[PDB]
Design a protein around this motif. Structure first.
Motif, PDB file in Angstrom:
ATOM      1  N   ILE A   1       0.858  -1.196   0.000  1.00 27.58           N
ATOM      2  CA  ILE A   1       0.000   0.000   0.000  1.00 27.58           C
ATOM      3  C   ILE A   1       0.900   1.255   0.000  1.00 27.58           C
ATOM      4  N   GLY A   2       0.654   2.173  -0.934  1.00 25.17           N
ATOM      5  CA  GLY A   2       1.287   3.504  -0.901  1.00 25.17           C
ATOM      6  C   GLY A   2       0.307   4.479  -0.274  1.00 25.17           C
ATOM      7  N   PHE A   3       0.764   5.669   0.112  1.00 26.85           N
ATOM      8  CA  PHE A   3      -0.155   6.568   0.830  1.00 26.85           C
ATOM      9  C   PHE A   3       0.279   8.021   0.809  1.00 26.85           C
ATOM     10  N   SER A   4      -0.685   8.878   1.129  1.00 26.28           N
ATOM     11  CA  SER A   4      -0.439  10.314   1.261  1.00 26.28           C
ATOM     12  C   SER A   4      -1.468  10.855   2.243  1.00 26.28           C
ATOM     13  N   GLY A   5      -1.146  11.986   2.864  1.00 23.74           N
ATOM     14  CA  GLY A   5      -2.182  12.810   3.478  1.00 23.74           C
ATOM     15  C   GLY A   5      -3.090  13.430   2.427  1.00 23.74           C
ATOM     16  N   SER A   6      -4.298  13.762   2.842  1.00 27.61           N
ATOM     17  CA  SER A   6      -5.208  14.488   1.966  1.00 27.61           C
ATOM     18  C   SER A   6      -4.763  15.948   1.815  1.00 27.61           C
TER      19      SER A   6
ATOM     20  N   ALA B   1       0.114  18.114  -5.929  1.00 25.42           N
ATOM     21  CA  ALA B   1       1.244  17.421  -5.315  1.00 25.42           C
ATOM     22  C   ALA B   1       0.875  16.013  -4.838  1.00 25.42           C
ATOM     23  N   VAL B   2      -0.289  15.867  -4.190  1.00 27.16           N
ATOM     24  CA  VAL B   2      -0.729  14.528  -3.729  1.00 27.16           C
ATOM     25  C   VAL B   2      -0.927  13.557  -4.910  1.00 27.16           C
ATOM     26  N   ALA B   3      -1.514  14.034  -6.017  1.00 29.30           N
ATOM     27  CA  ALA B   3      -1.711  13.163  -7.179  1.00 29.30           C
ATOM     28  C   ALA B   3      -0.361  12.755  -7.776  1.00 29.30           C
ATOM     29  N   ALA B   4       0.551  13.711  -7.892  1.00 29.32           N
ATOM     30  CA  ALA B   4       1.875  13.420  -8.458  1.00 29.32           C
ATOM     31  C   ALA B   4       2.616  12.408  -7.581  1.00 29.32           C
ATOM     32  N   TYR B   5       2.476  12.588  -6.274  1.00 31.42           N
ATOM     33  CA  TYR B   5       3.192  11.771  -5.270  1.00 31.42           C
ATOM     34  C   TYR B   5       2.667  10.332  -5.266  1.00 31.42           C
ATOM     35  N   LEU B   6       1.349  10.194  -5.220  1.00 29.61           N
ATOM     36  CA  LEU B   6       0.746   8.862  -5.309  1.00 29.61           C
ATOM     37  C   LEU B   6       1.041   8.157  -6.639  1.00 29.61           C
TER      38      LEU B   6
ATOM     39  N   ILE C   1      -5.523   7.544   0.908  1.00 29.33           N
ATOM     40  CA  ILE C   1      -5.505   8.971   1.218  1.00 29.33           C
ATOM     41  C   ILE C   1      -6.001   9.104   2.653  1.00 29.33           C
ATOM     42  N   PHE C   2      -5.121   9.582   3.522  1.00 27.56           N
ATOM     43  CA  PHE C   2      -5.427   9.796   4.911  1.00 27.56           C
ATOM     44  C   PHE C   2      -5.927  11.223   5.128  1.00 27.56           C
ATOM     45  N   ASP C   3      -7.234  11.374   5.307  1.00 28.90           N
ATOM     46  CA  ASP C   3      -7.826  12.676   5.639  1.00 28.90           C
ATOM     47  C   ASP C   3      -8.120  12.740   7.137  1.00 28.90           C
ATOM     48  N   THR C   4      -7.059  12.604   7.926  1.00 30.75           N
ATOM     49  CA  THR C   4      -7.212  12.425   9.371  1.00 30.75           C
ATOM     50  C   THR C   4      -7.926  13.598  10.040  1.00 30.75           C
TER      51      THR C   4
ATOM     52  N   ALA D   1      -9.987   6.171   0.410  1.00 29.72           N
ATOM     53  CA  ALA D   1      -9.985   7.433   1.176  1.00 29.72           C
ATOM     54  C   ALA D   1     -10.560   7.229   2.564  1.00 29.72           C
ATOM     55  N   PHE D   2      -9.951   7.887   3.554  1.00 33.36           N
ATOM     56  CA  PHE D   2     -10.394   7.753   4.928  1.00 33.36           C
ATOM     57  C   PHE D   2     -10.421   9.123   5.580  1.00 33.36           C
ATOM     58  N   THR D   3     -11.629   9.623   5.857  1.00 34.81           N
ATOM     59  CA  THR D   3     -11.785  10.812   6.712  1.00 34.81           C
ATOM     60  C   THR D   3     -12.224  10.311   8.088  1.00 34.81           C
TER      61      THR D   3
END
Ligand code: NA
Length: 357
Positions: free
Chosen positions: A146-151, A192-197, A210-213, A251-253
Protein backbone atom coordinates in the motif's frame (compact mmCIF):
# COMPACT_ATOMS: atom_id res chain seq x y z
CA UNK A 1 3.26 -15.21 -19.59
CA UNK A 2 1.76 -13.78 -16.37
CA UNK A 3 1.25 -9.97 -16.04
CA UNK A 4 3.33 -9.60 -12.87
CA UNK A 5 5.27 -11.57 -10.32
CA UNK A 6 3.17 -14.18 -8.57
CA UNK A 7 1.39 -12.70 -5.56
CA UNK A 8 1.00 -15.54 -3.03
CA UNK A 9 -1.64 -13.65 -1.03
CA UNK A 10 -3.80 -11.02 -2.83
CA UNK A 11 -7.06 -11.19 -0.76
CA UNK A 12 -6.58 -7.53 0.29
CA UNK A 13 -6.64 -6.27 -3.31
CA UNK A 14 -9.54 -8.53 -4.20
CA UNK A 15 -11.64 -7.27 -1.30
CA UNK A 16 -11.00 -3.64 -2.24
CA UNK A 17 -12.46 -4.54 -5.64
CA UNK A 18 -15.50 -6.32 -4.08
CA UNK A 19 -14.38 -9.67 -5.50
CA UNK A 20 -15.18 -13.14 -4.06
CA UNK A 21 -12.64 -14.25 -1.40
CA UNK A 22 -12.30 -17.09 1.14
CA UNK A 23 -11.89 -14.77 4.12
CA UNK A 24 -11.75 -11.12 5.16
CA UNK A 25 -8.28 -9.64 4.81
CA UNK A 26 -6.73 -7.49 7.53
CA UNK A 27 -4.04 -4.86 7.80
CA UNK A 28 -3.63 -2.33 10.59
CA UNK A 29 -2.87 1.38 10.70
CA UNK A 30 0.52 1.86 12.44
CA UNK A 31 1.32 -1.87 12.13
CA UNK A 32 4.90 -0.59 11.99
CA UNK A 33 5.12 1.35 15.23
CA UNK A 34 6.26 1.78 18.81
CA UNK A 35 4.19 -1.10 20.17
CA UNK A 36 6.91 -3.38 18.62
CA UNK A 37 10.20 -3.51 20.63
CA UNK A 38 12.07 -4.15 17.32
CA UNK A 39 10.64 -0.94 15.81
CA UNK A 40 12.10 1.03 18.76
CA UNK A 41 15.44 -0.75 18.37
CA UNK A 42 15.53 0.15 14.67
CA UNK A 43 14.44 3.71 15.46
CA UNK A 44 17.35 3.96 17.90
CA UNK A 45 19.84 2.87 15.20
CA UNK A 46 18.41 5.48 12.79
CA UNK A 47 18.57 8.26 15.39
CA UNK A 48 15.03 9.57 14.85
CA UNK A 49 11.67 9.04 13.25
CA UNK A 50 12.72 11.12 10.20
CA UNK A 51 15.89 9.04 9.94
CA UNK A 52 13.72 5.95 9.47
CA UNK A 53 11.48 7.58 6.87
CA UNK A 54 14.30 9.20 4.86
CA UNK A 55 16.48 6.08 4.37
CA UNK A 56 15.00 3.32 2.23
CA UNK A 57 16.84 0.50 4.10
CA UNK A 58 15.33 1.62 7.44
CA UNK A 59 11.88 2.29 5.91
CA UNK A 60 11.98 -1.24 4.39
CA UNK A 61 13.15 -2.82 7.63
CA UNK A 62 10.31 -1.39 9.74
CA UNK A 63 7.70 -2.00 6.98
CA UNK A 64 8.52 -5.74 7.13
CA UNK A 65 8.64 -6.08 10.96
CA UNK A 66 4.89 -6.59 11.56
CA UNK A 67 4.82 -9.15 8.68
CA UNK A 68 7.45 -11.22 10.52
CA UNK A 69 5.21 -11.35 13.57
CA UNK A 70 1.72 -11.56 12.15
CA UNK A 71 0.12 -13.00 9.01
CA UNK A 72 -1.21 -9.58 7.91
CA UNK A 73 -2.66 -9.37 4.39
CA UNK A 74 -0.77 -6.25 3.27
CA UNK A 75 2.28 -4.13 3.88
CA UNK A 76 2.06 -0.35 3.99
CA UNK A 77 4.96 1.84 2.93
CA UNK A 78 6.61 3.28 6.02
CA UNK A 79 6.78 7.04 5.61
CA UNK A 80 5.05 10.17 6.89
CA UNK A 81 2.31 12.32 5.35
CA UNK A 82 4.51 15.41 5.86
CA UNK A 83 7.11 14.41 3.25
CA UNK A 84 5.25 16.56 0.68
CA UNK A 85 5.38 19.90 2.61
CA UNK A 86 8.99 19.08 3.54
CA UNK A 87 9.78 18.73 -0.22
CA UNK A 88 7.97 22.05 -0.74
CA UNK A 89 10.72 23.53 1.44
CA UNK A 90 8.83 24.19 4.67
CA UNK A 91 11.55 22.57 6.80
CA UNK A 92 10.06 19.62 8.67
CA UNK A 93 11.48 18.48 12.02
CA UNK A 94 10.46 16.12 14.85
CA UNK A 95 5.28 16.19 17.35
CA UNK A 96 6.10 17.74 13.94
CA UNK A 97 7.18 21.37 13.42
CA UNK A 98 7.87 23.42 10.26
CA UNK A 99 10.58 26.08 10.09
CA UNK A 100 8.31 27.94 7.64
CA UNK A 101 4.56 27.87 8.48
CA UNK A 102 2.23 29.00 5.65
CA UNK A 103 0.50 32.20 6.81
CA UNK A 104 0.51 35.01 4.23
CA UNK A 105 -0.36 35.51 0.55
CA UNK A 106 3.40 35.58 -0.19
CA UNK A 107 3.93 32.23 1.64
CA UNK A 108 1.18 30.67 -0.49
CA UNK A 109 2.69 32.17 -3.66
CA UNK A 110 5.92 30.28 -2.95
CA UNK A 111 4.09 26.89 -2.89
CA UNK A 112 4.65 24.68 -5.91
CA UNK A 113 4.26 21.02 -6.80
CA UNK A 114 7.61 19.41 -5.96
CA UNK A 115 9.55 17.49 -8.61
CA UNK A 116 8.78 14.15 -6.97
CA UNK A 117 11.82 12.39 -8.48
CA UNK A 118 14.26 15.10 -7.36
CA UNK A 119 12.93 15.86 -3.85
CA UNK A 120 11.17 12.65 -2.78
CA UNK A 121 13.32 9.98 -4.41
CA UNK A 122 13.77 8.44 -0.98
CA UNK A 123 10.08 7.57 -0.88
CA UNK A 124 10.00 5.90 -4.32
CA UNK A 125 13.33 4.18 -3.46
CA UNK A 126 11.63 2.77 -0.35
CA UNK A 127 8.70 1.52 -2.48
CA UNK A 128 11.16 -0.19 -4.89
CA UNK A 129 13.16 -1.71 -2.05
CA UNK A 130 10.05 -2.97 -0.22
CA UNK A 131 8.80 -4.70 -3.39
CA UNK A 132 12.19 -6.41 -3.70
CA UNK A 133 12.12 -7.36 0.02
CA UNK A 134 8.61 -8.84 -0.27
CA UNK A 135 9.94 -11.22 -2.97
CA UNK A 136 10.91 -14.78 -1.92
CA UNK A 137 13.59 -17.11 -3.33
CA UNK A 138 11.37 -18.15 -6.24
CA UNK A 139 10.50 -14.58 -7.29
CA UNK A 140 6.95 -14.53 -5.80
CA UNK A 141 5.55 -11.63 -3.78
CA UNK A 142 4.32 -12.41 -0.23
CA UNK A 143 1.62 -9.68 0.18
CA UNK A 144 0.56 -6.48 -1.68
CA UNK A 145 2.07 -3.08 -0.91
CA UNK A 146 0.00 0.00 0.00
CA UNK A 147 1.29 3.50 -0.90
CA UNK A 148 -0.15 6.57 0.83
CA UNK A 149 -0.44 10.31 1.26
CA UNK A 150 -2.18 12.81 3.48
CA UNK A 151 -5.21 14.49 1.97
CA UNK A 152 -4.89 18.03 0.65
CA UNK A 153 -6.80 19.37 3.70
CA UNK A 154 -4.90 17.33 6.25
CA UNK A 155 -1.55 18.51 4.73
CA UNK A 156 -2.87 22.10 4.79
CA UNK A 157 -3.61 21.74 8.53
CA UNK A 158 0.02 21.01 9.40
CA UNK A 159 1.35 23.52 6.83
CA UNK A 160 -0.63 26.51 8.15
CA UNK A 161 -0.44 25.50 11.83
CA UNK A 162 3.33 25.09 11.42
CA UNK A 163 3.26 21.69 13.09
CA UNK A 164 1.02 19.39 15.14
CA UNK A 165 -2.16 20.33 16.98
CA UNK A 166 -5.01 18.97 19.11
CA UNK A 167 -7.77 20.88 17.25
CA UNK A 168 -6.19 22.87 14.33
CA UNK A 169 -8.34 25.87 15.22
CA UNK A 170 -5.77 28.26 13.58
CA UNK A 171 -6.10 26.70 10.07
CA UNK A 172 -9.90 26.40 10.29
CA UNK A 173 -10.09 30.07 11.23
CA UNK A 174 -7.95 30.89 8.13
CA UNK A 175 -10.44 28.94 5.93
CA UNK A 176 -13.20 31.27 7.16
CA UNK A 177 -11.09 34.45 7.20
CA UNK A 178 -9.07 33.98 3.99
CA UNK A 179 -10.88 31.33 1.89
CA UNK A 180 -9.07 32.38 -1.33
CA UNK A 181 -5.63 31.70 0.19
CA UNK A 182 -6.91 28.44 1.68
CA UNK A 183 -8.16 27.30 -1.75
CA UNK A 184 -4.79 28.20 -3.31
CA UNK A 185 -3.01 26.00 -0.72
CA UNK A 186 -5.48 23.16 -1.32
CA UNK A 187 -5.11 23.43 -5.14
CA UNK A 188 -1.30 23.08 -4.96
CA UNK A 189 -1.61 20.27 -2.36
CA UNK A 190 -4.02 18.29 -4.57
CA UNK A 191 -1.66 18.49 -7.54
CA UNK A 192 1.24 17.42 -5.31
CA UNK A 193 -0.73 14.53 -3.73
CA UNK A 194 -1.71 13.16 -7.18
CA UNK A 195 1.88 13.42 -8.46
CA UNK A 196 3.19 11.77 -5.27
CA UNK A 197 0.75 8.86 -5.31
CA UNK A 198 1.28 8.31 -9.05
CA UNK A 199 5.07 8.20 -8.44
CA UNK A 200 4.52 5.60 -5.70
CA UNK A 201 2.31 3.53 -8.08
CA UNK A 202 4.96 3.65 -10.82
CA UNK A 203 7.53 2.46 -8.27
CA UNK A 204 5.32 -0.51 -7.29
CA UNK A 205 2.52 0.54 -4.86
CA UNK A 206 -0.42 -1.76 -5.68
CA UNK A 207 -3.09 0.19 -3.76
CA UNK A 208 -3.09 3.81 -2.54
CA UNK A 209 -4.63 5.34 0.54
CA UNK A 210 -5.50 8.97 1.22
CA UNK A 211 -5.43 9.80 4.91
CA UNK A 212 -7.83 12.68 5.64
CA UNK A 213 -7.21 12.43 9.37
CA UNK A 214 -8.34 15.99 10.10
CA UNK A 215 -11.26 16.26 7.70
CA UNK A 216 -13.62 15.36 10.53
CA UNK A 217 -12.73 18.60 12.35
CA UNK A 218 -14.67 20.52 9.63
CA UNK A 219 -18.31 21.66 9.70
CA UNK A 220 -20.74 20.22 7.19
CA UNK A 221 -20.35 22.37 4.06
CA UNK A 222 -16.77 23.32 4.97
CA UNK A 223 -15.84 19.60 4.78
CA UNK A 224 -17.04 19.37 1.20
CA UNK A 225 -15.54 22.71 0.11
CA UNK A 226 -12.12 22.43 1.82
CA UNK A 227 -11.48 18.65 1.96
CA UNK A 228 -13.80 16.47 -0.14
CA UNK A 229 -13.61 18.46 -3.39
CA UNK A 230 -9.80 18.16 -3.20
CA UNK A 231 -9.94 14.40 -2.54
CA UNK A 232 -12.05 14.18 -5.71
CA UNK A 233 -9.48 16.33 -7.62
CA UNK A 234 -6.69 13.94 -6.54
CA UNK A 235 -8.66 10.78 -7.49
CA UNK A 236 -9.55 12.21 -10.91
CA UNK A 237 -5.79 12.42 -11.64
CA UNK A 238 -4.65 9.04 -10.25
CA UNK A 239 -3.34 6.12 -12.27
CA UNK A 240 -6.05 3.47 -11.90
CA UNK A 241 -4.04 0.59 -13.40
CA UNK A 242 -0.40 -0.59 -13.29
CA UNK A 243 1.50 -3.79 -14.13
CA UNK A 244 -1.70 -5.27 -15.64
CA UNK A 245 -3.79 -4.80 -12.50
CA UNK A 246 -6.28 -2.30 -11.13
CA UNK A 247 -4.66 -0.15 -8.42
CA UNK A 248 -7.46 0.39 -5.87
CA UNK A 249 -7.76 3.84 -4.26
CA UNK A 250 -8.89 4.23 -0.61
CA UNK A 251 -9.99 7.43 1.18
CA UNK A 252 -10.39 7.75 4.93
CA UNK A 253 -11.78 10.81 6.71
CA UNK A 254 -11.70 10.06 10.45
CA UNK A 255 -14.93 11.38 11.93
CA UNK A 256 -16.41 11.35 8.42
CA UNK A 257 -19.28 8.85 8.93
CA UNK A 258 -21.96 11.39 8.03
CA UNK A 259 -20.31 11.94 4.65
CA UNK A 260 -19.92 8.32 3.59
CA UNK A 261 -22.19 8.68 0.56
CA UNK A 262 -20.26 11.81 -0.52
CA UNK A 263 -16.89 10.03 -0.14
CA UNK A 264 -18.23 6.98 -1.99
CA UNK A 265 -19.11 9.19 -4.96
CA UNK A 266 -15.58 10.63 -5.38
CA UNK A 267 -14.37 7.79 -7.61
CA UNK A 268 -12.43 5.88 -4.92
CA UNK A 269 -12.69 2.10 -4.82
CA UNK A 270 -12.92 1.99 -1.01
CA UNK A 271 -13.76 4.20 1.98
CA UNK A 272 -12.17 3.85 5.48
CA UNK A 273 -14.40 4.14 8.56
CA UNK A 274 -13.92 4.77 12.24
CA UNK A 275 -15.49 2.83 15.09
CA UNK A 276 -18.54 5.05 15.57
CA UNK A 277 -19.98 3.86 12.24
CA UNK A 278 -22.27 0.85 12.10
CA UNK A 279 -20.45 -1.24 9.49
CA UNK A 280 -23.56 -3.12 8.27
CA UNK A 281 -25.52 0.14 7.90
CA UNK A 282 -22.58 1.66 6.02
CA UNK A 283 -22.56 -1.32 3.64
CA UNK A 284 -26.28 -0.72 2.97
CA UNK A 285 -25.68 3.04 2.62
CA UNK A 286 -23.10 2.55 -0.15
CA UNK A 287 -25.14 -0.31 -1.71
CA UNK A 288 -21.98 -2.13 -2.87
CA UNK A 289 -20.67 0.89 -4.79
CA UNK A 290 -17.39 0.83 -2.83
CA UNK A 291 -15.50 -1.49 -0.49
CA UNK A 292 -15.36 -0.53 3.21
CA UNK A 293 -12.24 -0.63 5.38
CA UNK A 294 -12.30 -0.67 9.23
CA UNK A 295 -13.46 -0.25 11.84
CA UNK A 296 -12.39 -1.64 15.20
CA UNK A 297 -11.74 0.76 18.12
CA UNK A 298 -7.96 0.43 18.77
CA UNK A 299 -8.64 0.77 22.51
CA UNK A 300 -10.25 -2.70 22.35
CA UNK A 301 -6.70 -4.11 21.99
CA UNK A 302 -6.16 -3.33 25.67
CA UNK A 303 -8.93 -5.70 26.72
CA UNK A 304 -8.47 -9.44 27.35
CA UNK A 305 -8.04 -11.78 24.37
CA UNK A 306 -11.60 -13.20 24.66
CA UNK A 307 -12.98 -9.64 24.52
CA UNK A 308 -10.75 -8.71 21.57
CA UNK A 309 -11.87 -11.76 19.61
CA UNK A 310 -15.57 -11.21 20.46
CA UNK A 311 -15.37 -7.61 19.22
CA UNK A 312 -13.62 -8.71 16.03
CA UNK A 313 -16.47 -11.22 15.47
CA UNK A 314 -19.01 -8.41 16.03
CA UNK A 315 -17.43 -6.19 13.38
CA UNK A 316 -17.41 -9.05 10.86
CA UNK A 317 -20.97 -10.12 11.73
CA UNK A 318 -22.15 -6.51 11.27
CA UNK A 319 -20.80 -6.48 7.70
CA UNK A 320 -22.22 -9.97 7.05
CA UNK A 321 -21.58 -12.46 4.29
CA UNK A 322 -20.86 -10.05 1.41
CA UNK A 323 -17.75 -9.13 -0.57
CA UNK A 324 -15.97 -5.81 -0.15
CA UNK A 325 -14.73 -5.56 3.46
CA UNK A 326 -11.07 -5.01 4.53
CA UNK A 327 -10.75 -5.34 8.30
CA UNK A 328 -8.74 -2.55 9.99
CA UNK A 329 -8.88 -0.32 13.07
CA UNK A 330 -10.56 3.08 13.05
CA UNK A 331 -7.23 4.67 14.04
CA UNK A 332 -3.63 3.58 14.62
CA UNK A 333 -2.37 0.89 17.00
CA UNK A 334 -1.51 2.48 20.35
CA UNK A 335 2.18 2.45 21.30
CA UNK A 336 1.14 0.70 24.53
CA UNK A 337 -0.58 -2.25 22.80
CA UNK A 338 0.71 -5.75 23.69
CA UNK A 339 1.90 -7.30 20.38
CA UNK A 340 0.21 -10.59 21.26
CA UNK A 341 -3.16 -8.78 21.26
CA UNK A 342 -2.50 -7.85 17.64
CA UNK A 343 -1.68 -11.53 16.94
CA UNK A 344 -5.01 -12.58 18.52
CA UNK A 345 -6.96 -10.00 16.47
CA UNK A 346 -5.42 -11.12 13.16
CA UNK A 347 -6.03 -14.78 14.01
CA UNK A 348 -9.74 -14.24 14.89
CA UNK A 349 -10.48 -12.07 11.88
CA UNK A 350 -9.05 -14.78 9.63
CA UNK A 351 -10.76 -17.74 11.33
CA UNK A 352 -14.18 -16.18 11.91
CA UNK A 353 -14.40 -14.62 8.44
CA UNK A 354 -13.47 -17.95 6.84
CA UNK A 355 -16.37 -19.50 8.85
CA UNK A 356 -18.72 -16.78 7.52
CA UNK A 357 -17.41 -16.82 3.90
NA1 NA B 1 -9.06 -15.25 -0.74
Amino acid sequence: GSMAQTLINDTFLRALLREPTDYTPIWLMRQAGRYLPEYNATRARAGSFLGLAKHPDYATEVTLQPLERFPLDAAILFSDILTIPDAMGLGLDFGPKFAHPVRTEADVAKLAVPDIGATLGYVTDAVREIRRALTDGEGRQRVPLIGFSGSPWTLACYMVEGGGSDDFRTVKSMAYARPDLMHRILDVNAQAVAAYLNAQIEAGAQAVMIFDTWGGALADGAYQRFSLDYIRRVVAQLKREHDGARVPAIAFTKGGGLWLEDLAATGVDAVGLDWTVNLGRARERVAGRVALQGNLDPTILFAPPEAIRAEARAVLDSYGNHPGHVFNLGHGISQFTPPEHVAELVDEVHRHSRAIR
